[PDB]
Ligand binder design. Structure first.
Ligand code: ATP
Ligand code: ATP
Ligand code: ATP
Ligand code: ADP
Ligand code: ADP
Ligand code: ADP
Ligand code: MG
Ligand code: MG
Ligand code: MG
Lengths: 485, 485, 485
């Protein structure tokens, strides 16, 4: 008599991919291999319901004992025992009793359905989570029997009018959606949780395969499990709207600011690319030093150099990062790119930005984060970081180490130049057998910028941008040819 | 006694691939994994029949309850309850009753066939849709029994003379066409719906494998599910006929118009390619500004820069996009390439063009749309966009960011240059250690165009195209060599 | 009533990936193919418990006889017989007796559980290891029966309150986690041991798939089995904190030290890259000679040249490595890269550093170690070596043979330049048909360094760094062009 209403799950990123949550009064199928977060998803569904909408929830477990479920939920800061004592949550223990011997007859799904209905009526439950129906159906080896029993369960829960989340099982990550293969077709809604193993690394993704009668974002979306539960990131949080401003921000190098027409833009992304030793880290350090000298908070996400090495280099360049950190203006987060996946790094960056509320951020060596990851996943990560930084009106400074040290015919082999607003090209220039460096403002959207490929030297005082090689040809090749007069 | 007549389905793009629709008086097999749109296809078949030809339809469901089918159809704006009340549609509920216990004997297909025949005679039905015969046949584990029962059903429905759509099931996207493997050979017509997972993205494709006694377009064809149902796009809508005209349209840069022999052609595709920062977005902005200054509607499909960043850059270039939007002359659609698949982007572009009726369109950075997609799918998308724009007599301006910033030996690594009519090559030119830019009209079909590689500078007033580097060699390499006199 | 406490295993690297060990009072599933170290892991778990925390352990074996288990443990220096005699360890022999005939009834898991409970009560056991439950469950061909029995066992061991390690079985390295496929879902914790075969080489990795109610590091982590048991290396031991100092260390070439602004840094990584014959080994030899002349211990990890060939070349260069070794100041470890995997090489390097306590280390030809290994695994190895060296305040000198001998447009095709602090670029320079060499300090973090591409010749006295090619262009190409005056 009406359209397909949805019930928000309040799981970060799930409601966005599901376009409003799970459909109301229907059964949703959550399928995934071991460790994919099925139990976590089901528990978070009820917990969020109870906490945000005061909707009593029912949890049906067939393997994990209720005590173990409550003990598990605490790792996320969830006190399920408090909810149980308040009558808001009820954990229906349907696990086989050890004292109960094997039964040769078809397991009584009718008794379980009656118990669930009684619990729903008693606690006025609006949400139901069913843990590992596959444990129930393994006694039902036949696939037809399994489909019939799932159909009975879904139809009964539908007649009761409760929103249900059923966790099922799969052997392969990209094989059958569920074990028997009849689970994904009896359910109205199918959610797939994967733990893809790529490059000796586990990537967790969530996919909404079908929402009968409703639109949803298609494909796999990476998600992480942290102290707050499941955190899904829908493809860079789409576009949104961030009103870019003309406000200028200094780069810490006055000559570079002149080269940029008055410094960088506050709501812009700066990309300093070049070969190793070109001074990208020096520009990042001067950027952070300028940020903090103006009593503005900043963060330095490093991924190649340790904290102490950064400190030593900054001190050698006349920058006291220790005093900056003591003043509470600078927070240096360094970490090896491998230590965690790109989604984990994005979550850490978001959390640090939220806790510190910085005005500027400097990520060192995006190339380091691109190690051993597919170009598509890397691009998704950069989209996420850039969008999040622009949304908070945060000035971003990113560095990318070019793989070729001279003759580099591309700005970035990952092709992130299309996403950045300002591009600083740093390169070596062979001059009289000496390896001079050159800095050029390759790109600046919305601002005039010096086209000069200007020489600069690195001293104890920082970078000193000199004149341009106005008597040389093919500087870009790294090996220019000098012309008389 | 006659040839093989076909019954139109009126599903956008299906009748084209099927060369007139589904054959009349025969059973069509619609096979696909979970969430492929089998139920949607079957429902749309009957709904389109009833609404466009007043042909009563019969829907046979074995899992989804009739109430749920009616509730599902509303997401597409279809009021199936109205049709049921009018006697034009009948939903035959054949789902197993929960109160009915298991039956050890072969399920009575004869009773179902008799019920379907009675319904067809009562409602004078010309169309029939059968939902998940696989649910029926899972009780028939044996494949031979399944083939026999499908043969009986198809033969009976054929004797009745109704056009039937049967939805069947598969475990793998590219595995067996159906579960048992006997379904695709008893049916006269086989349609395969796939939800291929590639690059963490779901691509939906429809394939007509065989139409016994009729020709059909071969292979997979992408299709999307939106608020209007299934929308199939047959390989760029073939050729068609768009009478190109000699009418000229200004580019917003008078010197560029002179370089093009009087501006671009109205019914032509313009491709501005170059490295990052070369000013492709500037040319797009001037193009849109010229379009709107002449009181002509235009659309800007951006995929790298946000709306506000485009606004800021345009204002910095003396272009007021806000006033343009207020006047109803400009509509700016920006969106990340990942947010949706290429078919979805094509559908969005088509819908926006239809709703706005623009005279010009400007897509920013086709390269952004090529991220993480196969070259073939990208090429298909460009063919679609170019053909649709040319059909509506719309002038298209596309930008492609070259992956190499100097020495680019190709116009486009995706090789779309063969599809575009006008090509504007933008490149950096190293001159006296300064990174000057160069604009050249690489290509212009049906018009004389300046061969000069002309220098241009970007100011607050826009691009100023200066003279050509007439005293330099190897400009194209990016690092030219100057010659005296 | 409390959070999820964990029990340390004291297995090197396991507690780090598991974030504190195995959860207390729960069953952990250790699955892996033949030879993956399941039995070794289970035995080490109990042995470490007993030896470090005085926690009595119970070992349940179904195939390996207790005598054979004790005999096996001695290869790691573990005297399990001493623990058994002390009552700290009990090996419960549950293997089928040869005199016991086949049983058609379901094997009595209840009797085994009662025996285990009796043993736990008698020895006050806190840890339990179960060897090859799969041998038990093969008589239970049915997967449902297997899941039920595993559930009974886990629930009973949980009620007893002991931490349990259960070793299960798999046929494929990346196939089902366990044989039946029900083992990984009844267990609260799943650990996967793999012996991946890549390039005719076996790579052993450990993965913690899920720790219910606790966070853990995700993905595969390489581990080796040596005379001390399982040794896991969690992704380079994360970041840690190594306070870099400004202390300078001589390179053995005074002119090179001048080029580096006073020599290399003590807590830094030096990378000498160049074509074959450029003199990387000469720089390594002079580095070691300077290390030992100052009465400082050093190690030379070679991977291309034999010990005697290194001796001969050093003597030809006026360096007496034999006297250095006799004095106990130099230890030369040479070995073919293939002889062992990257994890094995890392373990050997760590062990040698620990036994010798060197002040400097010189690894010859990282490129040799990159032969036939994925770039990701190689990068992980370099991260490990660099981090370990920096942690011990050890100066590292690494050499990388460039694959291209002239025109090399990159420092390292493996792109390790981002990880190194000092980069010495060695290259050939064609001059008047003579193949002169050139040395340039490409990079030096935290120090001024000469930008000059200086010629050097190799004599019996070592390298003699001459002036720079100040009258030549395109030296970097290898084929420079001379200019008059
Ligand atoms: N506080 C936490 N922070 C981060 N990750 C956590 C946290 N608690 C649990 N996890 C992770 O979440 C996963 C838990 O999965 P969950 O129990 O929800 O279901 P599942 O793995 O889909 O199915 P199964 O019931 O077979 O375990 C584990 O792999 C664990 O690593
Ligand atoms: N209004 C809509 N707009 C866009 N997509 C929709 C809309 N309504 C439904 N969908 C999508 O269409 C799909 C519905 O598939 P459908 O029910 O027709 O059959 P099927 O997936 O082939 O088979 P099954 O019966 O197993 O679900 C879902 O995956 C859903 O995402
Ligand atoms: N002292 C040692 N040093 C190095 N490697 C060792 C040592 N002792 C044993 N190994 C290795 O450890 C492995 C022993 O594996 P383990 O017996 O622990 O269990 P598993 O291989 O997982 O299972 P299974 O019970 O089927 O053998 C062997 O492959 C052997 O090469
Ligand atoms: N005190 C100094 N004087 C002059 N140059 C220095 C000094 N300290 C460091 N440098 C230079 O700084 C360079 C490092 O720059 P950095 O920003 O770390 O490069 P990257 O592009 O890899 O981030 C060194 O290669 C060296 O040339
Ligand atoms: N006010 C201005 N004056 C001169 N140049 C400008 C001005 N604003 C922007 N630019 C130039 O515009 C360039 C951006 O051009 P754009 O069309 O966005 O490049 P793309 O080819 O990436 O689309 C900047 O790199 C800068 O050189
Ligand atoms: N006594 C010598 N006099 C001059 N040159 C020598 C002498 N002994 C060896 N060389 C030079 O040393 C080079 C080897 O340098 P080495 O460090 O082994 O190169 P790599 O970069 O491969 O490690 C030889 O190619 C040769 O040019
Ligand atoms: Mg750096
Ligand atoms: Mg652009
Ligand atoms: Mg060598």
């Amino acid at each position: 008599l009406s359209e397909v209403q949805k019930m928000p799950t309040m799981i970060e990123g799930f409601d966005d991919i599901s376009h409003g949550g799970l459909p109301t009064g229907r059964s949703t199928l959550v399928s995934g291999t071991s460790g994919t977060g099925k139990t976590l998803f089901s528990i978070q569904f009820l917990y969020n319901g109870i906490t945000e909408f005061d909707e009593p929830g029912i949890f049906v477990t067939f393997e994990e004992s209720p005590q173990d479920i409550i003990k598990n939920a605490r790792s996320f800061g969830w006190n399920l025992q408090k909810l149980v004592d308040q009558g808001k949550l009820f954990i229906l223990d349907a696990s086989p009793d050890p004292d109960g011997q094997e039964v040769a007859g078809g397991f009584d799904l009718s008794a379980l359905i009656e118990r669930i209905n009684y619990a729903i009526q008693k606690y006025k439950a609006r949400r139901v989570s069913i843990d590992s129906v596959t444990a129930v159906f393994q006694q039902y080896d036949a696939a037809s029997v399994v489909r019939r029993e799932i159909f009975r369960l879904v139809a009964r829960l539908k007649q009761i009018g409760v929103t249900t989340v059923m966790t099922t099982e799969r052997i392969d990550e990209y094989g059958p959606i569920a074990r028997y293969g009849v689970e994904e077709f009896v359910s109205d809604n199918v959610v797939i949780l994967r733990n893809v193993l790529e490059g000796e690394r586990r990537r967790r993704t969530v996919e909404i395969l079908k929402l009968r009668g409703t639109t949803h974002m298609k494909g796999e979306y990476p998600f992480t499990i942290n102290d707050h539960g499941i955190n899904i990131f829908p493809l860079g949080a789409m576009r949104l709207t961030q009103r870019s401003s003309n406000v200028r921000v200094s780069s810490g190098v006055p000559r570079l600011d002149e080269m940029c027409g008055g410094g960088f833009f506050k709501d812009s992304i700066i990309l300093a690319t070049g070969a190793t030793g070109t001074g990208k880290t020096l520009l990042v350090s001067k950027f952070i030093e300028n940020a903090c000298q103006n009593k503005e908070r900043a963060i330095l996400f490093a991924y190649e150099e340790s904290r102490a090495q950064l400190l030593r280099n900054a001190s050698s360049w006349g920058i006291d990062f220790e005093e900056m950190e003591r003043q509470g203006l600078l927070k240096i987060i360094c970490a090896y790119p491998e230590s965690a996946g790109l989604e984990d790094h994005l979550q850490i960056i978001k959390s640090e930005i939220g806790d510190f509320k910085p005005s500027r951020i400097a990520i060192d060596s995006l190339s380091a984060l691109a190690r051993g990851v597919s170009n598509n996943a890397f691009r998704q990560f950069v989209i996420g970081v850039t969008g999040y930084a622009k949304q908070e009106e945060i000035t971003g400074f990113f560095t990318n180490t070019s793989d070729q040290f001279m003759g580099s015919h591309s700005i970035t082999d990952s092709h992130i130049s299309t996403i950045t607003d300002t591009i600083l090209l740093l390169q070596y220039v062979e001059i009289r057998g000496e390896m001079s460096r050159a800095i050029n403002v390759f790109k600046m959207r919305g601002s005039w910028h010096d086209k000069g490929i200007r020489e600069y030297v690195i001293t104890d005082k920082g970078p000193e941008i000199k004149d341009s090689f106005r008597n040389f040809e093919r500087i870009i090749s790294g090996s220019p040819t000098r012309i008389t007069v």
